């Protein structure tokens, strides 16, 4: 115990951890279906000083 106390002074925690190579997200991205919708020139009207 005396010997270990003497060398303990010269030590500090070696912050090492262990994880997985790949960690998937909790919720995988949902496949969004394609739906055709016409060009709309009003979608920016509420951004900044818009003009209706």
């Amino acid at each position: 115990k005396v010997a270990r106390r003497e060398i303990g002074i010269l030590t500090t925690n070696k912050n090492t951890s262990r994880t997985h190579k790949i960690i998937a997200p909790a919720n995988l991205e949902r496949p969004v279906r394609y739906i055709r919708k016409p060009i709309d020139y009003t979608i920016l009207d509420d951004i900044g000083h818009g003009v209706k």
Binding site: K1, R4, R5, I7, G8, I9, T11
Partner: peptide, 8 residues
Amino acid sequence: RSMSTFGK
């Protein structure tokens, strides 16, 4: 997990 034997 601290090691008291090394004075921790």
